[PDB]
Design a protein around this ligand. Structure first.
Ligand SMILES: [Mg+2]
Ligand SMILES: [Mg+2]
Ligand SMILES: [Mg+2]
Ligand SMILES: [Mg+2]
Ligand SMILES: [Mg+2]
Ligand SMILES: [Mg+2]
Ligand SMILES: [Mg+2]
Length: 1376
RNA sequence: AUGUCACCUCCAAUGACUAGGGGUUUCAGUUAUUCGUGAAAACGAAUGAAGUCACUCUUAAAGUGAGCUGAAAUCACUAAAAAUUAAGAUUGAACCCGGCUACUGACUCUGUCAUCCGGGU
DNA sequence: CTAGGGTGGGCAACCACA
DNA sequence: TAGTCATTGGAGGTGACAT
DNA sequence: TGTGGTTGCCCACCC
C-alpha cells in the first residue's frame, strides 16, 4: 500500500491545499507540496449565471416582440389579402410595443374614504357636490385621468401641490371632529394613491394591461391604421385582435413559427388554432380564475375560424396567469434500496433461498408484515424502467418481496436482532457465548451450507451502508444497493396523512377528523395549534430557549414575568391539545408524550393547513417503509433506510466547487503520475475542514442575546415614507439594493439580497438611483426624522457608527434578532462614507456568497474531486495496474483552529492567522497543513493512514511543523481563451453599447477646399491640393459645396479590405475612409454630476478638449490636411453648463450639492401634454461626446424591411491570435493577426486590414529570453497585442531590493502585489533592465512563494528590447 | 453530545420561467401650416407623433450640428427556431419531437396535457 | 469564509528621426 | 426593477436508532 | 512631413 494524502482548507475564494505521497507514515521533505488555489472573483471566471440569464431573457423579450410582429403581420395581410405598407407596419408595431406587465395589483383599498365627508374637500376642487360621495367623484376623477383629460391632469397636480401643507385641513377637522387621526389616514391614503398616479406616467409605462385601454383609445386616433379598421370591420375587433396577440408568450410564438416552411411567413389557420389551444393549456390558472380559463379555451377550442376568435375573445381574459414552474427539474430521491437486480446478477437465485430460509424461522415473525402495501408504489429507477418495458424480470413482486424482507432482516434494531449480524461479521468479538449462540441460531435457520456466502454478503452490505452514511457510496466498487433516482411526490393529501401519522406516532392514520375536535369552549385543535405556531414563529429560533427557561423558572417556584406566564399558558394549551388528540384517535400515554410539545403541534398546523411548496425527500415507498421500521406507535422494529447523503449543488455552487475540484484533481493527478510505481494499491485519503456557518439565530448566541415575512419586514422598515424622495410610499413601491446590483455583480459576481442591503422605496427613488453610489445626504429629512428621531446627518452618522461598532459580526449576520433601531443602523450604515469603518464592515458582512461556498459543501466537493481524480488517472492506473482506494475524513474547524493553528502561531510567529485584516495567501496552505496536523491525531484516520507513535504532545507537535515545505505554489485558474474555444458563442464576444460612426464632411468653394463641419477656423481644416483627395475618393463621395461619403459604400469597402485581399487603390481608399472617420456617443447630461462622490464637477471637466477634438491628418499622398476639428456638439454642452439653472452650480475650476441628479431630471421634463395615451416616457437625457475606444467591430445586420444596417460595437475579448512569422522566422510585431471567430461576411474589425499568415507565433507561447544574468530567470510571451507578459523567477530578497516591498516574510505576501508608483520607479531603477519593462498599474501576480519568488506580470507598455529578446528566443527554438 | 433518516419554520445562496421600463445605435421625419380665442404679446385645438435651438454663409436659400418624435437593430457564424453573453478535461442549462406502457406535475382525473420520461439539437 | 478598480484594446502627446 | 417556481447549505425544534 | 517608438491614461448597459 502507498499512502497518498490530500488536505484541503476550503475557501470561498482562496483554498489551501497540502498534499503528499509516501510509502508509509510521514512524508519526506520533498514529497509534501503546498498549493493555494485563488478562484478569481474579478470576473476572470464566471460562476454566476445572473448576467447570462438576464441576457437570455432580454433576448427572449426581444424575440417575443419580433415574433409577435411577425404573427401580427401574417394575420393582418391574411385579413387584407394584400401586403402592408411600411407606414401600416410602423403603426401596427407601434401598437405592439410596450405592452406592460401582467401581475396582480387587483384593487386599491380606499376604505378610509368611506367615513370622510365630501364637503371638507371642496377647497381643492370647487366643482364637487356634497350630494355626491367622495368615492364616486374620485372614481370619476381617475376615469378622466385615464381618458387624457388635460383639465383632470391639472386638477391632479393642483391637488398634489395643495395637499402638502395640511395645517388648515387638520385645524378644520379638529374644529368639527374630536379625532383627527382617521382624517390623517384618509389624507395619507389620498396622497398615497395619487402619487402612484404621478408615477407610472413619469417612470415607465408600467401598465397592468391598461395597455389594452391605452391602445383602445389610440387605435381610432392613428390615421395609418384606417385601412386596417374596415378590414377588421371595427375598432373593437382590431383592438381585441391586437390585445389577444399581445398577450401571447414567446413559447406560443415559438410553437407557431417552429417549421422550416414557416421561413416564408405563410398563414396556416389550423396550425394557429392548435398553437393557441396548446398555449392556453400550458398555464396553471388559480382557483378563482378557472372560469376565465374555461372561457378562453372554449373560445380557442371551439373556433371554426381562429382569426375571428382572436377578434371576438376579450383580451383581458387572455392575460396569462403567474408562472408555475413547480415541476421544472424535480429532485431524485437518494434512498438506497437492496437491489434484486444486482443480487441475482451476483448470487443468482441463491439469495431467494436465503430469504426463504430466514423467513421460515419463528424469530422472523412479522418481518414481512405490511409488504403488500409497501410494494404497490415504485421505489427505484430500474423497477420503473422494467415497468415501462412491461417486462418484470428482476423486479417482479416476489423478488421485491424477498429483497425487502432481506433488507428488513439486515437493518433490524439491536433489541430485535436475533442473529447479531453486525457483531457476527465484525472484526472484533466480545464475550464468545452470545456470539456462539447467535451463529448457532443463524446456522439453524439459514442452513450451514449457506452460512459463508450470506455472511460475506452481510459484511459487504454493512460496509456499503457505512460508506453510504459518510457520503461515500460512490466509492464502492461492487455495489449491492442501488439509488432510487425517482422523483418523489409534492405533498398531496396521501403524503399529508403519512406525515401527520409520523408526527402523531400512529401507523394507520386514515383521516384528519381529530383536527376539528373541540378542546375547551368553542376553540378547536385548529385554533390552539394556529396560536401555537403564531407564537413560535414570533419568537423564532430563541423560542425553545425562552420556553424551556419559563418552564424551569415555573418548576423551581421562582417568579414569572408576563412572557414566561404566556409560555406557561402555552404549556397548558399543548397539554390540552395533546390530551384531546390522544383521546380522538386513541393514542396511548407513552406515545402521547412524544408530541405533547409546541413544536410538534406547530408542525401539525404547518403540514395540515399551509399549502405545499416543494417535493418531499423520499418516495412514498420509502416513507411507508421507514414508517414501518420506526414503528412510532410502539417500539422500533428496524433501523431506518439509508440514503446517499451527497445532495446535488446544481448551480453556481456547482461551478465554483467543480472548478476547485478539477484543479485539485489535476494537482493530485500529476503529483501521483510524476512518481513511478506499478501494480500496488495506493490509498488516497481526503481531509476536509467542517465549515458550518449560522445564517439564522444560534443557541449559543440567543442565550447571550435574551438576557412579518422578509418582504413585509423591508416594507415596514421604511415607515410608509420613501427614503430617497420623502413621498408617502404605500404598497406600489420597489425594493432597492443600496449597494447596487450591477456594482456587486461587477466586483463580486453576486447580488446582495440580505435584508440590510434592501430598502423599500418608490419608483422615483429607485430609477434616479442608478449604479452610482448614494450617501446619507440624499435621504429625505422627514424620513430621517421618522427613523432616527432627527434629521441631523452628523448626529445620525455618529449614532450609526457607535451602534454598529457595538454589534459583533455574528449578531449582524444573524440579522433578525436586532431590534428596530439596530436593524435601521445596520441598513443605513450603507449610506455612510467610503472610509467609514461601519460601512466597510457591513459591505463585507453581507458578501455571503463567500460564506455559502464553504457552508456544508464539503461532501459534494469531495465526491466531485474523487470522481475527477479517478477519471484523470484512469489510464495511468490502467497502464500501471494501480488501484486507488479513496477515503474521506472531515475535521472540526474549531478543533483544528484552536488546537493546531494557534499552536503553530505560538511556535512560529509568521504562521499566525490575522483576524482584523485580510489573511495572507500562504496562511490558507497553513490551515490545510493544520488540517493534516489534526488528522494524524485521530486514531481512525491514522490507523489506515499510517502508524501510531503519538507518545507526547510536544514531540509530535514539533516534529510535524517541519513537514510543510518552504515554498508554496499559487494556482490561479483562468477561463479558456477565446482563441482556443471551438464554441465561441459561449463567451460574451463583444460588449453591449453601440457607438455612433461619423465621417468628416468635405467643403469646397471654388479652388479652396477643406475638411470639417463649417467654414469657421475651429470647425474645419484647410486641404492643400484637394484634387488628390477627390482622386483617391472616386465612387465613395456624394454631393449634397458639401461632399459627404456614401455610408453604405464606405462600410462595404472597409469590410472588403478586411475580409479579402484587395488592390492598392482600394487600400488607399480605405486609408482615406479611416482618416475621415470618427466616433461619438451620447453620454448623459447627469455626467455633470459626480454620482459617486455626490458633487458637481468643474466646467473644465465637462468642456475638456479631449472629449470634443478630432485629429485630422491625411498627408501629401491624399492632399495634406493636418489639424484639429472641434465637435459642434460642444456648443450644446456649453448650453448645458451655461443655462439659467445650472450656471451657478458648475464652477470654472475645482459645494457637494446633495441629490443633483434629481435636479437634472427636474430640469428636463415633458412639459407639454402627450396626445397619445400609449407613448413612451423618457428618463435619461444625453449629449454626444468623443468616447474612449477599444477594439471595435462593425456588424452588418438587417432591419425589418430587409435593408443592411451597420452598427459599431467594441470587442470584449482578445482580437489578436498571435503574430505573423515569415519563412525566415522573423516575428512581425506590427501587424494585427485577427482571430478566426471574426473575419466573417458580417463583421469588420475597425481599422482592420486583410492579412495572410501561413505560420504565426501564438500569444500563449512562453519562451525564456536571455536577460544577461543568471540570478533571475525571465520568461516572456506575447500575451496581448500591445503588452507582453513577463514571468520572473527571482530571489525574494532581490525582489525586495529592486522594489522596496516591506511585507515582511513571504508567508505574509498576498497573491496580488500592488506596487505604488515609487515602488514601480524603484523596480525600473534598481533592475537596470529595460527588457523587464514595468508592471501594468504595479500589479504583480505571484506563481510560487518562498525564498525564491516566481511571479508574472503584464507589462505597462511594449518596448523594442522585449520584442528583440523574444525574437531571439523564438529564432533559437525555430531553427531547432 | 454528533452521525444518519423523516418532517416543521426561518435565514442565506443559487437558477428557472415570465417579463416590464429606461438606455445606446441605425434609418427616417421635423426646423412648421391651418383653425378659433385675443388689437396684440400669446393661448388652445387639428394635421399618426415630433415640430426647438445653435454655428457656418449673400440677407433669401442652403450646409452642418444638436434636440425632439416614430420605427428598427441591439452579440457573430445564422437561418423558420433551437442553441447562442457559462464552462470546456468533463458538463450544465435551454428548446423541440414522441409517450402516457409510467416516475413527477396541472386539470374538467377510464383521460388529456406537460415543466415529467425517452430521444434529438 | 471574507477585507473587493481588470484587460485588451484604443487614443493623444512628445521625441527621436528624416 | 416585478411576479412565480424549485434546490442547496446552515440555525432552532420534534420523532427513530447508533455510536 | 511622415514614421516609428515611449508614456500616460481611458473605456466597458442599467433599474
Ligand atoms: Mg478553514
Ligand atoms: Mg436601485
Ligand atoms: Mg482558507
Ligand atoms: Mg434618437
Ligand atoms: Mg400521471
Ligand atoms: Mg411536448
Ligand atoms: Mg427543461
Amino acid at each position: 500500500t502507498v499512502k497518498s494524502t490530500l488536505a484541503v482548507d476550503m475557501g470561498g475564494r482562496y483554498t489551501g491545499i497540502f498534499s503528499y505521497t509516501t510509502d508509509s507514515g510521514f512524508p519526506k521533505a520533498k514529497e509534501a507540496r503546498a498549493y493555494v488555489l485563488n478562484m478569481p472573483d474579478n470576473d476572470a471566471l464566471t460562476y454566476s449565471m445572473a448576467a447570462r440569464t438576464q441576457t437570455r431573457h432580454r433576448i427572449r423579450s426581444q424575440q417575443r416582440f419580433v415574433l409577435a410582429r411577425r404573427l401580427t403581420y401574417i394575420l393582418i395581410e391574411g385579413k387584407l389579402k394584400r401586403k402592408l405598407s411600411p407606414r401600416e407596419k410602423e403603426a401596427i408595431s407601434s401598437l405592439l410595443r410596450r405592452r406592460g406587465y401582467s401581475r396582480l395589483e387587483s384593487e386599491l383599498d380606499l376604505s378610509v374614504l368611506q367615513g370622510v365627508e365630501s364637503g371638507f374637500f371642496k377647497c381643492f376642487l370647487p366643482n364637487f357636490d356634497e350630494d355626491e360621495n367622495l368615492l364616486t367623484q374620485w372614481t370619476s376623477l381617475t376615469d378622466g385621468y385615464l381618458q387624457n383629460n388635460s383639465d383632470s391632469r391639472r386638477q391632479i397636480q393642483i391637488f398634489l401641490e395643495s395637499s402638502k401643507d395640511s395645517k388648515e385641513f387638520l385645524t378644520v377637522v379638529k374644529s368639527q371632529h374630536q379625532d383627527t387621526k382617521e382624517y390623517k389616514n384618509a389624507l395619507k391614503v389620498m396622497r398615497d394613491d395619487a402619487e402612484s398616479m404621478i408615477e407610472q406616467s413619469m417612470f415607465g409605462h408600467k401598465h397592468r394591461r391598461l395597455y389594452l385601454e391605452a391602445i383602445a383609445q389610440d387605435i381610432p386616433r392613428d390615421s395609418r391604421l384606417k385601412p386596417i379598421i374596415e378590414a377588421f370591420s371595427g375598432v373593437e375587433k382590431f383592438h381585441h385582435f391586437i390585445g389577444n396577440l399581445s398577450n401571447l408568450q414567446l413559447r406560443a410564438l415559438r410553437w407557431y413559427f417552429n417549421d422550416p416552411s414557416m421561413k416564408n411567413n405563410v398563414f396556416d389557420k389550423e396550425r394557429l388554432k392548435s398553437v393557441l389551444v396548446r398555449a392556453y393549456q400550458f398555464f396553471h390558472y388559480p382557483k378563482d380564475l378557472t372560469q376565465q380559463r374555461a372561457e378562453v379555451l372554449n373560445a380557442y377550442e371551439g373556433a371554426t375560424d381562429i382569426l375571428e376568435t382572436l377578434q371576438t375573445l376579450n383580451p383581458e381574459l387572455t392575460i396569462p396567469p403567474y408562472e408555475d414552474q413547480n415541476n421544472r427539474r424535480p429532485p431524485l430521491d437518494q434512498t438506497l434500496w437492496l437491489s434484486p437486480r444486482l443480487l441475482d446478477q451476483r448470487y443468482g437465485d441463491t439469495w431467494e433461498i436465503w430469504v426463504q430460509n430466514l423467513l421460515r424461522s419463528p424469530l422472523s415473525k412479522g418481518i414481512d408484515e405490511n409488504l403488500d402495501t409497501i410494494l404497490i408504489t415504485t421505489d427505484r429507477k430500474a423497477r420503473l424502467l422494467e415497468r415501462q418495458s412491461g417486462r418484470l424480470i428482476h423486479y417482479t413482486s416476489q423478488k421485491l418481496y424477498h429483497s425487502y424482507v432481506l433488507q428488513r432482516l439486515l437493518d433490524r434494531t439491536v433489541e430485535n436482532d436475533a442473529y447479531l449480524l453486525k457483531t457476527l461479521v465484525s472484526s472484533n468479538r466480545g464475550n464468545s457465548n452470545e456470539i456462539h449462540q447467535a451463529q448457532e441460531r443463524l446456522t439453524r435457520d439459514l442452513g450451514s451450507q449457506h452460512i459463508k456466502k450470506f455472511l460475506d454478503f452481510v459484511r459487504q452490505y454493512y460496509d456499503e451502508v457505512d460508506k453510504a452514511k459518510r457520503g461515500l457510496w460512490f466509492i464502492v466498487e461492487k455495489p449491492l444497493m442501488e439509488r432510487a433516482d425517482i422523483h418523489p411526490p409534492m405533498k398531496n393529501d396521501s403524503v399529508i396523512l403519512r406525515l401527520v401519522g409520523n408526527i402523531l406516532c400512529v401507523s394507520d392514520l386514515v383521516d384528519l377528523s381529530f383536527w376539528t375536535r373541540k378542546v375547551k369552549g368553542q376553540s378547536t385543535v385548529r385554533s390552539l395549534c394556529t396560536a401555537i405556531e403564531k407564537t413560535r414563529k414570533e419568537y423564532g429560533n430563541s423560542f425553545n430557549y425562552l420556553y424551556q427557561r419559563a418552564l424551569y423558572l415555573q418548576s423551581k417556584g421562582k417568579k414569572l414575568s408576563a412572557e414566561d406566564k404566556d409560555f406557561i399558558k402555552l404549556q397548558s394549551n399543548v397539554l390540552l391539545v395533546s390530551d384531546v388528540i390522544a383521546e380522538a384517535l386513541d393514542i396511548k400515554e407513552e406515545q402521547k408524550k412524544k408530541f405533547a410539545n409546541p413544536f410538534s403541534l406547530a408542525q401539525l398546523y404547518n403540514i395540515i393547513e399551509t399549502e405545499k411548496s416543494g417535493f418531499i425527500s423520499t418516495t412514498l415507498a420509502a416513507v411507508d417503509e421507514n414508517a414501518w421500521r420506526n414503528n412510532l406507535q410502539g417500539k422500533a422494529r428496524c433501523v431506518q433506510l439509508c440514503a446517499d447523503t451527497v445532495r446535488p449543488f446544481d448551480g453556481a455552487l456547482r461551478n465554483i466547487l467543480d472548478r476547485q475540484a478539477y484543479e485539485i484533481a489535476k494537482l493530485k493527478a500529476e503529483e501521483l503520475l510524476s512518481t513511478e510505481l506499478k501494480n500496488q494499491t495506493i490509498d488516497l485519503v481526503v481531509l476536509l475542514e467542517s465549515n458550518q456557518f449560522a445564517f439564522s439565530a444560534s443557541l449559543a448566541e440567543v442565550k447571550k442575546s435574551a438576557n412579518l415575512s422578509k418582504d413585509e419586514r423591508i416594507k415596514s422598515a421604511s415607515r410608509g415614507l420613501c427614503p430617497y424622495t420623502g413621498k408617502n410610499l404605500g404598497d406600489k413601491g420597489e425594493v432597492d439594493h443600496i449597494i447596487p446590483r450591477s456594482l456587486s455583480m461587477n466586483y463580486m459576481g453576486s447580488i446582495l439580497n440580505s435584508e440590510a442591503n434592501l430598502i423599500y422605496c418608490s419608483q422615483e427613488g429607485n430609477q434616479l438611483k442608478l449604479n452610482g453610489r448614494k450617501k446619507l445626504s440624499d435621504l429625505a429629512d422627514n424620513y430621517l426624522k421618522v427613523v432616527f428621531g432627527t434629521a441631523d446627518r452628523g448626529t445620525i452618522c455618529k449614532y450609526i457608527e457607535k451602534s454598529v461598532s457595538e454589534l459583533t459580526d455574528a449578531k449582524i449576520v444573524q440579522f433578525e434578532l436586532l431590534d428596530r433601531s439596530q436593524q435601521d443602523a445596520v441598513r443605513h450604515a450603507l449610506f455612510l462614507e467610503d472610509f467609514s469603518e461601519a460601512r466597510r464592515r457591513i459591505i463585507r458582512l453581507l458578501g455571503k456568497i463567500n460564506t455559502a461556498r464553504v457552508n456544508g459543501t464539503q461532501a459534494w466537493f469531495a465526491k466531485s474531486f474523487i470522481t475527477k481524480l479517478r477519471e484523470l488517472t484512469k489510464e495511468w492506473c490502467a497502464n500501471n495496474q494501480i488501484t486507488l482506494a479513496f477515503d474521506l475524513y472531515r475535521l472540526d474547524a474549531q478543533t483544528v483552529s484552536q488546537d493546531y493553528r494557534k499552536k503553530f502561531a505560538l511556535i512560529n510567529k509568521d504562521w499566525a492567522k490575522p483576524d482584523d485584516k485580510k489573511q495572507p495567501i500562504a496562511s490558507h496552505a497553513i490551515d490545510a497543513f493544520c488540517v493534516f496536523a489534526a488528522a494524524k491525531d485521530k486514531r481512525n484516520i491514522a490507523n489506515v493512514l499510517g502508524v501510531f507513535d503519538e507518545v507526547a504532545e510536544e514531540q509530535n507537535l514539533k516534529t510535524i511543523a517541519q513537514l510543510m515545505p518552504s515554498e508554496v505554489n499559487l494556482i490561479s485558474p483562468k477561463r479558456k481563451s477565446i482563441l482556443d474555444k471551438n464554441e465561441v458563442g459561449s463567451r460574451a464576444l463583444m460588449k453591449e453599447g453601440i457607438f455612433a460612426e461619423h465621417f468628416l464632411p468635405i467643403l469646397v468653394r471654388g479652388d479652396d477646399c477643406r475638411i470639417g463641419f463649417d467654414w469657421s477656423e475651429s470647425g474645419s481644416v484647410k486641404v492643400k491640393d484637394a484634387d488628390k483627395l477627390f482622386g483617391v475618393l472616386d465612387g465613395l463621395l456624394k454631393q449634397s459645396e458639401t461632399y459627404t461619403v456614401d455610408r453604405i459604400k464606405a462600410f462595404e469597402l472597409l469590410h472588403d479590405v478586411f475580409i479579402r485581399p484587395c488592390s492598392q487603390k482600394m487600400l488607399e481608399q480605405a486609408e482615406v475612409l479611416e482618416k475621415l472617420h470618427y466616433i461619438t456617443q451620447n453620454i448623459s447630461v447627469t455626467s455633470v454630476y459626480d454620482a459617486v462622490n455626490r458633487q458637481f464637477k468643474c466646467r473644465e471637466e465637462i468642456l475638456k478638449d479631449k472629449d470634443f477634438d478630432i485629429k485630422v491628418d491625411l498627408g501629401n499622398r491624399f492632399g495634406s490636411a493636418k489639424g484639429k476639428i472641434t465637435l459642434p456638439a460642444k456648443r450644446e454642452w456649453e448650453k448645458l453648463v451655461n443655462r439659467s439653472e445650472l450656471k451657478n452650480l458648475i464652477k470654472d475650476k475645482l459645494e457637494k450639492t446633495p441629490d443633483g441628479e434629481t435636479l437634472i431630471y427636474d430640469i428636463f421634463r415633458s412639459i407639454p401634454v402627450q396626445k397619445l395615451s400609449h407613448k413612451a416616457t423618457r428618463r435619461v437625457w444625453s449629449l454626444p461626446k468623443i468616447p474612449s475606444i477599444s477594439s471595435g467591430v462593425r456588424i452588418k445586420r438587417k432591419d425589418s424591411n430587409g435593408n443592411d444596417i451597420y452598427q459599431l460595437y467594441m470587442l470584449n475579448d482578445t482580437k489578436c491570435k498571435g503574430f505573423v512569422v515569415n519563412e525566415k522566422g522573423v516575428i512581425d510585431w506590427s501587424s494585427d493577426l485577427v482571430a478566426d471567430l471574426y473575419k466573417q461576411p458580417t463583421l469588420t474589425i475597425l481599422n482592420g486590414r486583410y492579412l495572410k499568415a501561413d505560420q504565426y507565433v501564438r500569444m500563449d507561447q512562453w519562451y525564456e529570453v536571455d536577460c544577461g544574468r543568471d540570478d533571475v530567470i525571465v520568461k516572456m510571451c506575447p500575451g496581448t497585442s500591445g503588452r507582453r507578459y513577463i514571468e520572473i523567477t527571482q530571489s525574494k530578497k532581490q525582489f525586495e531590493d529592486w522594489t522596496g516591498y516591506i511585507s515582511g516574510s513571504f508567508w505574509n505576501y498576498p497573491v496580488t502585489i500592488k506596487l505604488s508608483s515609487q515602488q514601480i520607479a524603484n523596480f525600473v531603477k534598481n533592475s537596470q533592465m529595460p527588457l523587464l519593462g514595468k508592471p501594468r498599474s504595479g500589479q504583480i501576480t505571484v506563481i510560487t512563494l518562498g525564498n525564491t519568488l516566481k511571479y508574472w506580470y503584464c507589462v505597462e507598455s511594449k518596448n523594442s528590447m522585449m520584442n528583440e529578446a523574444y525574437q531571439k528566443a523564438y529564432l533559437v527554438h525555430f531553427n531547432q
